Design an enzyme around this catalytic site. Structure first.
Site, PDB file in Angstrom:
ATOM      1  N   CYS A 228       0.831  -1.312   0.152  1.00  0.00           N
ATOM      2  CA  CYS A 228      -0.034  -0.002   0.098  1.00  0.00           C
ATOM      3  C   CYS A 228       0.674   1.303   0.104  1.00  0.00           C
ATOM      4  O   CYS A 228       0.464   2.192   0.514  1.00  0.00           O
ATOM      5  CB  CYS A 228      -0.878  -0.053   1.226  1.00  0.00           C
ATOM      6  SG  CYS A 228      -2.586  -1.172   0.804  1.00  0.00           S
ATOM      7  N   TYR A 272      -1.505   4.405   0.913  1.00  0.00           N
ATOM      8  CA  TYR A 272      -2.456   4.678  -0.207  1.00  0.00           C
ATOM      9  C   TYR A 272      -2.446   6.070  -0.941  1.00  0.00           C
ATOM     10  O   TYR A 272      -3.042   6.544  -1.738  1.00  0.00           O
ATOM     11  CB  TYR A 272      -3.945   4.350  -0.259  1.00  0.00           C
ATOM     12  CG  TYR A 272      -3.971   2.676  -0.150  1.00  0.00           C
ATOM     13  CD1 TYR A 272      -3.289   1.898   0.321  1.00  0.00           C
ATOM     14  CD2 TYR A 272      -5.451   2.531   0.048  1.00  0.00           C
ATOM     15  CE1 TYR A 272      -3.535   0.549   0.235  1.00  0.00           C
ATOM     16  CE2 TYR A 272      -6.095   1.106   0.033  1.00  0.00           C
ATOM     17  CZ  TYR A 272      -4.830   0.063   0.261  1.00  0.00           C
ATOM     18  OH  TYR A 272      -5.273  -1.212   0.235  1.00  0.00           O
ATOM     19  N   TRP A 290      -5.125   5.538   4.589  1.00  0.00           N
ATOM     20  CA  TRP A 290      -5.234   4.159   4.647  1.00  0.00           C
ATOM     21  C   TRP A 290      -4.297   3.784   5.925  1.00  0.00           C
ATOM     22  O   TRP A 290      -4.833   2.778   6.725  1.00  0.00           O
ATOM     23  CB  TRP A 290      -4.994   3.246   3.395  1.00  0.00           C
ATOM     24  CG  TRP A 290      -5.118   1.958   3.549  1.00  0.00           C
ATOM     25  CD1 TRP A 290      -6.117   1.170   3.320  1.00  0.00           C
ATOM     26  CD2 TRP A 290      -4.050   0.971   3.960  1.00  0.00           C
ATOM     27  NE1 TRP A 290      -5.855  -0.149   3.611  1.00  0.00           N
ATOM     28  CE2 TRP A 290      -4.695  -0.314   4.140  1.00  0.00           C
ATOM     29  CE3 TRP A 290      -2.719   1.182   4.215  1.00  0.00           C
ATOM     30  CZ2 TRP A 290      -4.030  -1.559   4.134  1.00  0.00           C
ATOM     31  CZ3 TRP A 290      -2.016  -0.268   4.542  1.00  0.00           C
ATOM     32  CH2 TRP A 290      -2.590  -1.478   4.901  1.00  0.00           C
ATOM     33  N   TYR A 495      -9.133  -5.689  -7.994  1.00  0.00           N
ATOM     34  CA  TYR A 495      -8.296  -4.956  -6.709  1.00  0.00           C
ATOM     35  C   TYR A 495      -6.996  -5.714  -6.535  1.00  0.00           C
ATOM     36  O   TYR A 495      -6.797  -6.858  -6.526  1.00  0.00           O
ATOM     37  CB  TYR A 495      -9.223  -5.017  -5.600  1.00  0.00           C
ATOM     38  CG  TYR A 495      -8.931  -4.228  -4.344  1.00  0.00           C
ATOM     39  CD1 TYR A 495      -8.505  -2.803  -4.208  1.00  0.00           C
ATOM     40  CD2 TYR A 495      -8.418  -5.033  -3.319  1.00  0.00           C
ATOM     41  CE1 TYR A 495      -8.194  -2.279  -2.942  1.00  0.00           C
ATOM     42  CE2 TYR A 495      -8.200  -4.581  -1.938  1.00  0.00           C
ATOM     43  CZ  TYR A 495      -7.791  -3.186  -1.988  1.00  0.00           C
ATOM     44  OH  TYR A 495      -7.251  -2.674  -0.663  1.00  0.00           O
ATOM     45  N   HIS A 496      -6.073  -4.895  -6.368  1.00  0.00           N
ATOM     46  CA  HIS A 496      -4.490  -5.426  -6.197  1.00  0.00           C
ATOM     47  C   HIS A 496      -3.838  -5.935  -7.536  1.00  0.00           C
ATOM     48  O   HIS A 496      -2.837  -6.610  -7.439  1.00  0.00           O
ATOM     49  CB  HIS A 496      -4.397  -6.275  -4.979  1.00  0.00           C
ATOM     50  CG  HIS A 496      -4.592  -5.448  -3.752  1.00  0.00           C
ATOM     51  ND1 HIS A 496      -5.050  -6.191  -2.486  1.00  0.00           N
ATOM     52  CD2 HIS A 496      -4.508  -4.169  -3.368  1.00  0.00           C
ATOM     53  CE1 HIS A 496      -4.887  -5.207  -1.543  1.00  0.00           C
ATOM     54  NE2 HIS A 496      -4.656  -4.178  -2.108  1.00  0.00           N
ATOM     55  N   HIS A 581      -2.259  -0.490  -7.135  1.00  0.00           N
ATOM     56  CA  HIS A 581      -3.703   0.150  -6.883  1.00  0.00           C
ATOM     57  C   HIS A 581      -4.193   1.040  -7.749  1.00  0.00           C
ATOM     58  O   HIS A 581      -4.883   1.986  -7.285  1.00  0.00           O
ATOM     59  CB  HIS A 581      -3.761   0.972  -5.333  1.00  0.00           C
ATOM     60  CG  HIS A 581      -3.513  -0.179  -4.124  1.00  0.00           C
ATOM     61  ND1 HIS A 581      -2.309  -0.664  -3.969  1.00  0.00           N
ATOM     62  CD2 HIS A 581      -4.206  -0.365  -3.187  1.00  0.00           C
ATOM     63  CE1 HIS A 581      -2.437  -1.462  -2.893  1.00  0.00           C
ATOM     64  NE2 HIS A 581      -3.622  -1.190  -2.456  1.00  0.00           N
TER      65      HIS A 581
HETATM   66 CU   LIG Z   1      -4.848  -2.565  -0.907  1.00  0.00          CU
END
Ligand SMILES: [Cu+2]
Ligand SMILES: [Ca+2]
Length: 639
Positions: A228, A272, A290, A495-496, A581
């Site tokens: 992240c 993030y 985040w 996601y990811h 991300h």
């Molecule tokens: Cu993440």
């Protein structure tokens, strides 16, 4: 902690062969449905023949195969785990061609998978090239092969997916190592989990496009779990990785020495956040709630020369916050940042409001108007993408995303933003008629010809779940102001997930998941080969070669002269990428204005403004009249 893309094929009429098998551990013990029985290669009195070892399946009839799985021994014995491996398919059982998947599996007893584009086949072959800890043996408790519902041949002209690269981690963050050409990837303190991290550890993996080798490393020297993070390649040629699971840390990846070096702590703890390299080679970052707390996290700037972070408290985050229902935890995430002229950073989204950030003194921010068109004001587009496909003309293509990070419908919205001078409100228009497929958590790269490749995502954003997936990529072609669907793939990349442009002009797309004991971890990546690498018959086209460059390191404003083995029509510089991300603030493209010296000698100038020609590593591509690009020549741009 993963899953196949297909359904298991019934094995009761399969015939199997192995390169060797101990008595009691016969080849067919891997397909008897018993978790406690296993195939094992020769040991003890029959000697200990080393890998490669091979398991071959005759399924008797053609199946639409899109994966296999390997269940290791479940009796605590660790010495037969498969490490490096290749998967082959065949219709006749004698000729196998290139692997449909290859790479390396993590060293533990969990079920391993190879997932790949559906291909009709009767025969399946698994080659265990190494044992996971270098021992002589191979064993398998259960092997299964999976089939898709149907098979559809790829359409000519729309590119090709494959092979799959199998990995020991979920590559939720990645970068090209420009000096070696390798893909660098990392997860968190564990191969597929960030939850419950003690901090101070990142698992990394690399893939070499030239050898196919997947390697791995445990990085503790920077005391940083880099899940992240912000990511930027600075002007000193080091990748600055910030915050995330260890929210105040900075780690530096040095491509030349292939090593990680500790950096200074950030002034503000973040996760993030986006960071962006600046015209002077420094790195700006802002936001990131985040991790490290949920509060207004204004700008700060890193100097590679002094090895310092300095707070820019008047570079205010407030004007760039989205209206996310979850509030600040989300609303300051993943800004669409671009380094620009005179130390400025343009913030194109995801918030409706666009802003200029300034890095002199204690920082500043100025409204740049709303992202909009004659269709109206663009809504917040969290985890939409933004790509600077023509830096010389200030062109940024934005697309997709959803108003909220999570539990929110993605859109087909897409814009072209045209940057002028810092402090002026850029023109924005709608891009074509928008995306074919609404998506969020998708990823994208600018290609040598200035088109933007867009892939993956899902229609409704639900992190860690592979629902409403979008399997068909799209390419935006600026000259036509048109989007084009490409051939679809078989693996959800939401996601990811990450994408990066490779020096050879193909796209590396991978990851998804990273939720520990979840079924949606994707321990892999796939190659997309664009149509510009194929001739009219679907064979790989002959590529022009750059046979000489006058220099490989140039100042902004400097000229380079090149020779080619054939005439070329166009050339471009594409800055090497980094990704996590949905964010990639490092890639961008400069179309080059060529002088034809005759005799297949050409020259060009690198733009004199380092806000356009952002310092760092760049790929030089030349393209012939047929549109086929060379492989990249690596150019260092300095200021
Ligand atoms: Cu993440
Ligand atoms: Ca068994």
């Amino acid at each position: 902690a993963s899953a196949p893309i297909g359904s298991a094929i019934p094995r009761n009429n399969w015939a199997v062969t192995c390169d060797s098998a101990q008595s009691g551990n016969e080849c067919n013990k891997a397909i008897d449905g018993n978790k406690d029985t296993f195939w094992h290669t020769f040991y003890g009195a029959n000697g200990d023949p080393k890998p490669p070892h091979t398991y071959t399946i005759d399924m008797k009839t053609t199946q639409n195969v899109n994966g296999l799985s390997v269940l290791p021994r479940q009796d605590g014995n660790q010495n037969g785990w498969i490490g490096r491996h290749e998967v082959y398919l065949s219709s006749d059982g004698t000729n196998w061609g290139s692997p449909v998947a290859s790479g390396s599996w993590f060293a533990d007893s969990t079920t391993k998978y190879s997932n790949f584009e559906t291909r009709p086949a009767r025969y399946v072959r698994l080659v265990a090239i190494t044992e996971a800890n270098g021992q002589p043996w191979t064993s398998i408790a259960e092997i299964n092969v999976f089939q898709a519902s149907s098979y559809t041949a790829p359409q000519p002209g729309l590119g090709r997916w494959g092979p799959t690269i199998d990995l020991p981690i979920v590559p939720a963050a990645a970068a090209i190592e420009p000096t070696s050409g390798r893909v660098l990837m990392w997860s968190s303190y564990r191969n597929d989990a960030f939850e419950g991290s003690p901090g101070g550890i990142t698992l990394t993996s690399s893939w070499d496009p030239s050898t196919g080798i997947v390697s791995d490393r445990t990085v503790t020297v920077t005391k940083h779990d880099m899940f992240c993070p912000g990511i930027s390649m600075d002007g000193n040629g080091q990748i600055v990785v910030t915050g995330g699971n260890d929210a105040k840390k900075t780690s530096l990846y040095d491509s030349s020495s292939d090593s990680w070096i500790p950096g200074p702590d950030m002034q503000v703890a973040r996760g993030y956040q986006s960071s962006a390299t600046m015209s002077d080679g420094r790195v700006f970052t802002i936001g990131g709630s985040w991790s490290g707390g949920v509060f207004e996290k204004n700008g700060e700037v890193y100097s590679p020369s002094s090895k310092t972070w300095t707070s820019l408290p008047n570079a205010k985050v407030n004007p760039m916050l989205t209206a996310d229902k979850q509030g600040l935890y989300r609303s300051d995430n993943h800004a669409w940042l671009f380094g620009w002229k005179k130390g400025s950073v343009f913030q194109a989204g995801p918030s409706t409001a666009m802003n200029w950030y300034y890095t002199s003194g204690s920082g500043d921010v100025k409204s740049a108007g709303k992202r909009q068109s004659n269709r109206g004001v663009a809504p917040d587009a969290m985890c939409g993408n933004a790509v600077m496909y023509d830096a010389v003309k200030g062109k940024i293509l934005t697309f997709g995303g959803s108003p909220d990070y999570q539990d929110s419908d993605a859109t087909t919205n897409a814009h072209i933003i045209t940057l002028g001078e810092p402090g002026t409100s850029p023109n924005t228009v709608f891009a074509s008629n928008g995306l074919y497929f609404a998506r969020t958590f998708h990823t994208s790269v600018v290609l040598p010809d200035g088109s933007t490749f867009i892939t993956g995502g899902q229609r409704r954003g639900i992190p860690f779940e592979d629902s409403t997936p979008v399997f068909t990529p799209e390419i935006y072609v600026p000259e036509q102001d048109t989007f084009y669907k490409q051939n679809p793939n078989s693996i959800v990349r939401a996601y990811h997930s990450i994408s990066l442009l490779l020096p050879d002009g193909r796209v590396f797309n991978g990851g998804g998941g990273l939720c520990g004991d979840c079924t949606t971890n994707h321990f892999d990546a796939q190659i997309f080969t664009p149509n510009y690498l194929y001739d009219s018959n679907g064979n790989l086209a002959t590529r022009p070669k750059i046979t000489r460059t006058s220099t490989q390191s140039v100042k902004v404003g400097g000229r380079i002269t090149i020779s080619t083995d054939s005439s070329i029509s166009k050339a471009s510089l594409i800055r090497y990428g980094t990704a996590t991300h949905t964010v990639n603030t490092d890639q961008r493209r400069i179309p080059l204005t060529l002088t034809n010296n005759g005799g297949n000698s050409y020259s060009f100038q690198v733009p004199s403004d380092s806000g356009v020609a952002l310092p760092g590593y760049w790929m030089l591509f030349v393209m012939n009249s047929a549109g086929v690009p060379s492989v990249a020549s690596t150019i260092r741009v300095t200021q």
